[PDB]
Design a protein around this ligand. Structure first.
Ligand SMILES: *[C@@H]1O[C@H](CO)[C@@H](O)[C@H](O)[C@H]1NC(C)=O
Ligand SMILES: *[C@@H]1O[C@H](CO)[C@@H](O)[C@H](O)[C@H]1NC(C)=O
Ligand SMILES: *[C@@H]1O[C@H](CO)[C@@H](O)[C@H](O)[C@H]1NC(C)=O
Ligand SMILES: *[C@@H]1O[C@H](CO)[C@@H](O)[C@H](O)[C@H]1NC(C)=O
Ligand SMILES: *[C@@H]1O[C@H](CO)[C@@H](O)[C@H](O)[C@H]1NC(C)=O
Ligand SMILES: *[C@@H]1O[C@H](CO)[C@@H](O)[C@H](O)[C@H]1NC(C)=O
Ligand SMILES: *[C@@H]1O[C@H](CO)[C@@H](O)[C@H](O)[C@H]1NC(C)=O
Ligand SMILES: *[C@@H]1O[C@H](CO)[C@@H](O)[C@H](O)[C@H]1NC(C)=O
Ligand SMILES: *[C@@H]1O[C@H](CO)[C@@H](O)[C@H](O)[C@H]1NC(C)=O
Ligand SMILES: *[C@@H]1O[C@H](CO)[C@@H](O)[C@H](O)[C@H]1NC(C)=O
Ligand SMILES: *[C@H]1O[C@H](CO)[C@@H](O)[C@H](O)[C@H]1NC(C)=O
Ligand SMILES: *[C@H]1O[C@H](CO)[C@@H](O)[C@H](O)[C@H]1NC(C)=O
Lengths: 214, 306
C-alpha cells in the first residue's frame, strides 16, 4: 500500500555537473530504501541500499541520503556513463510488499537543436500489400518535446498514426521522433496531399513537410 | 508446615504443563516470528508445511517473575527438605498461597536464573537407570555467566571447574562411587540442543558449550585462561521449542545486547554404555523446556479442596 513517488519525472543536466534525485514515500519506510540505475535494455543496477550505503563496487559520486519518507540519491560530478533511469525501491514493510518508484530519466541537457523533418511516402510495393505507411522522420533534436501533426488534405485529422522517440544518443545526445500515419489503400488513394507539421521548441516556427501522391 | 504425609511427582506434576503452556502463550504475544513453519500431515506420509507470516517487531523480551496462586477449591502444597528427590512421600509438606517468584527462562543445557539448592548440589531424575531420562542438576551455588550479542559468554573457569566437580561427585554418588565420571559435549542433534541455547534481548543465542562439557576426571584446562569464553552466535532461523517447526526472527538492531545470568542448574544426560566398565559419560541435555519448569516446581503440587 506504500507509494513511492520520484518527483523529478525527468532531469536534464550536463556532464560534470551535479544531479539530484528525490524519492517521496507514502508512510515511513525507515531506512529500507535502495536506489537502482537502469540503462536502456539492461537489468537494473543496485546503486544504494539501506538508504545511504553504496553497493559493493560503485562510484563514490553517487550519494545516498535520507531516512523516513524523504530519500535522495545526489550525484556530484555526473558522468557520461551516469545516464540512465533511476529507481528507488522500498522494502521496509513486512509481510513483503515492496514497491518501486516510478522513475526518473537522467538525460543530458545540451543545446536546443532543431529537427530536420524527412517525409517518406508509402513504397508502392507496400501499397500493393493493402495499406500505406507515411513515415515522417524527425532527425537529431533536443527537448524530446516535439509535437507533430498529420494533416491529410490540410485536414487536422489526428488518429491513425503512432510516434516513437529514440533514446538519447552517444555523440550528438539528441532524440529522433518518428510519427507514422498508416492509412488504407482506398483511402490513401482518396487523398491528395499528406503533410506532417513539426512544432518543436528549437524550431523558429512550424515546419510542414509534405507530398502529393506521386 | 502441614501436619500430613502426601505423595509428590515432579516428573508427573501437572503445574509444569500448566506453566509451560502459559510460557508458550507468554511467547506468542511478545516474540512473534516473521515466518513460522510447522508440519501438517494427514498421516499419508506427505507433509505440507504450514507457513505463517506476521509482523516481526523487535522487542527486548525481558522475562518477568511469575507466581502461581491457587484460586479456590484449590490449594498448593509445598515439600520441604534439603534433598528432595521430588518423587515420593514428602514428610514436611506445607500449604502455600503462591509458589515463589519464578522467572520463566527458556534455555537448553544450562538452567539460568532458576532457584538454587539450599543444602548441597542435588540431581533429580525420573530414573537415573534410564540413559534416556534427563538428569536435572541443581546447583547450590550459581555460576555467573555473561553473554553478549557481540558473540560470546564469559564464565569463571574456577567456578565452573569446581561445579563440574561438585556435580561429578554427586553423580558417582548415585551411579557408583567406584565409577569414573566424564563430561562430553552434545552427542548430536539440533543446534538448540547441541549448544547452550537461550534467548537474551529477544535474540536467540547459540553458545558452543564444548569448554563447559569436556571434563575428564583427571586433567584440567586453565593454562592461559582465567575465564571460559563460549563462542556464541545469534541465529534468525531457529527450531521452535513450543512446537516442531522453524521460525525466522528479524535480525538484531539494538546497539547492544547483554546478559548476566546465574547458572543455577544444568540438564545432563549420561550415555547408556550398555553396562560397560565404570565410565559414565554425561553430556549436555535439555530442549524440553518442561524439565526446566520442573526444576522449579519439583517441590510443588496443586490440589483440590476437601
Ligand atoms: C498439502 O497439504 C494440504 C493440507 O492443507 C493437503 O490438503 C494437500 O493434499 C497437500 N498437497 C498439496 C496441495 O501440496
Ligand atoms: C553445596 O554448596 C556449599 C556452599 O553453598 C558447598 O560448600 C558444598 O560443597 C556444596 N555441595 C556439593 C559439593 O555439591
Ligand atoms: C558479568 O557481569 C557482571 C556485571 O553484571 C560482572 O560483575 C561480572 O564480573 C561478569 N562476569 C564475568 C565477565 O565473568
Ligand atoms: C568398587 O565396588 C565395591 C563397592 O561396592 C568395592 O568394594 C570394590 O573394591 C570397587 N571395585 C572397583 C569397581 O574398582
Ligand atoms: C565449538 O562447537 C563445535 C560444534 O558445535 C565444535 O566442533 C568445535 O570444536 C567447538 N569449538 C571449541 C570452542 O572447542
Ligand atoms: C579431556 O581429555 C582429553 C584427552 O585426555 C583432552 O584432549 C581434553 O582437552 C580434556 N578436556 C579438558 C579440556 O579438560
Ligand atoms: C588456573 O587458572 C585460574 C584462572 O583461570 C587460576 O585462578 C588458578 O589459580 C589456576 N590454577 C593454579 C592454582 O595454578
Ligand atoms: C544472579 O545473577 C546476577 C547476574 O550476574 C548476579 O550478579 C547476582 O549476584 C545473581 N544473584 C543470585 C541469584 O545469587
Ligand atoms: C536472568 O536471566 C536472564 C536470562 O534470560 C538474563 O537475561 C537476565 O539478565 C538475568 N537477570 C538479570 C541480572 O537481569
Ligand atoms: C574398560 O575399558 C574398556 C572399555 O572400552 C574395556 O575394553 C576394558 O576391558 C575395561 N577395563 C579396562 C581394561 O580398563
Ligand atoms: C505433626 O505433629 C503431630 C503431633 O500430634 C502429629 O500428629 C502429626 O502427624 C505431625 N505431622 C507430621 C509433620 O508428620
Ligand atoms: C520439618 O519437620 C521436621 C520434623 O520435626 C523437622 O525435623 C524439619 O526441620 C522441618 N523442616 C523445616 C525446616 O521446615
Amino acid at each position: 500500500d506504500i507509494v513511492m513517488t520520484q518527483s523529478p519525472a525527468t532531469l536534464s543536466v550536463s556532464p560534470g555537473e551535479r544531479a539530484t534525485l528525490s524519492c517521496r514515500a507514502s508512510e515511513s519506510v525507515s531506512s529500507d530504501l535502495a536506489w537502482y540505475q537502469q540503462k536502456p535494455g539492461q537489468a537494473p543496477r543496485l546503486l544504494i541500499y539501506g538508504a545511504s550505503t553504496r553497493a559493493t563496487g560503485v562510484p563514490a559520486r553517487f550519494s545516498g541520503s535520507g531516512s523516513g519518507a524523504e530519500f535522495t540519491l545526489t550525484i556530484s560530478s555526473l558522468q557520461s556513463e551516469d545516464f540512465a533511469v533511476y529507481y528507488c525501491q522500498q522494502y521496509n514493510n513486512w509481510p513483503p510488499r515492496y514497491t518501486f518508484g516510478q522513475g526518473t530519466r537522467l538525460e543530458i541537457k545540451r543545446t536546443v537543436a532543431a529537427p530536420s523533418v524527412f517525409i517518406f511516402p508509402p513504397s508502392d510495393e507496400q501499397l500493393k500489400s493493402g495499406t500505406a505507411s507515411v513515415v515522417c522522420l524527425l532527425n537529431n533534436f533536443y527537448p524530446r518535446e516535439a509535437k507533430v501533426q498529420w494533416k491529410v488534405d490540410n485536414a487536422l485529422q489526428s488518429g491513425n498514426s503512432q510516434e516513437s522517440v529514440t533514446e538519447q544518443d552517444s555523440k550528438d545526445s539528441t532524440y529522433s521522433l518518428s510519427s507514422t500515419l498508416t492509412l488504407s489503400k482506398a483511402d490513401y488513394e482518396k487523398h491528395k496531399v499528406y503533410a506532417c507539421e513539426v512544432t518543436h521548441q528549437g524550431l523558429s516556427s512550424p515546419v510542414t513537410k509534405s507530398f502529393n501522391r506521386g | 508446615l502441614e501436619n500430613v504425609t502426601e505423595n509428590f511427582n515432579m516428573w508427573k506434576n501437572n503445574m509444569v504443563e500448566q506453566m509451560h503452556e502459559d510460557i508458550i502463550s507468554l511467547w506468542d504475544q511478545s516474540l512473534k516470528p516473521c515466518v513460522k513453519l510447522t508440519p501438517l500431515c494427514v498421516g499419508a506420509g506427505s507433509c505440507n508445511t504450514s507457513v505463517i507470516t506476521q509482523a516481526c517487531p523487535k522487542v527486548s523480551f525481558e522475562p518477568i517473575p511469575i507466581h502461581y496462586c491457587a484460586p479456590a477449591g484449590f490449594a498448593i502444597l509445598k515439600c520441604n527438605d534439603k534433598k528432595f528427590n521430588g518423587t515420593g512421600p514428602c514428610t514436611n509438606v506445607s500449604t502455600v498461597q503462591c509458589t515463589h517468584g519464578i522467572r520463566p527462562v527458556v534455555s537448553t543445557q544450562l538452567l539460568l536464573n532458576g532457584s538454587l539448592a539450599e543444602e548441597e548440589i542435588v540431581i533429580r531424575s525420573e530414573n537415573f537407570t534410564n540413559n534416556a531420562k534427563t538428569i536435572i542438576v541443581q546447583l547450590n551455588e550459581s555460576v555467573v555467566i555473561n553473554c553478549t550479542g557481540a558473540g560470546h559468554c564469559n564464565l569463571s573457569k574456577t567456578q565452573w571447574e569446581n561445579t563440574l566437580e561438585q556435580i561429578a561427585i554427586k553423580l558417582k554418588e548415585q551411579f557408583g562411587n567406584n565409577k569414573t565420571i566424564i563430561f562430553n559435549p552434545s552427542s548430536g542433534g539440533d543446534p538448540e540442543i547441541v549448544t547452550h541455547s537461550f534467548n537474551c534481548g529477544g535474540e536467540f543465542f547459540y553458545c558452543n558449550s564444548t569448554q563447559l562439557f569436556t571434563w575428564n576426571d583427571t586433567r584440567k584446562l586453565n593454562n592461559t585462561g582465567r575465564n571460559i569464553t563460549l563462542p556464541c552466535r545469534i541465529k534468525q532461523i531457529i527450531n521452535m521449542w513450543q512446537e516442531v517447526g522453524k521460525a525466522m526472527y528479524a535480525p538484531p538492531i539494538r546497539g547492544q545486547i547483554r546478559c548476566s545470568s546465574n547458572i543455577t542448574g544444568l540438564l545432563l544426560t549420561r550415555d547408556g554404555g550398555k553396562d560397560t566398565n565404570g565410565t559414565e559419560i554425561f553430556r549436555p541435555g535439555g530442549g524440553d523446556m518442561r524439565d526446566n519448569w520442573r526444576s522449579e516446581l519439583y517441590k510443588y503440587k496443586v490440589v483440590k479442596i476437601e
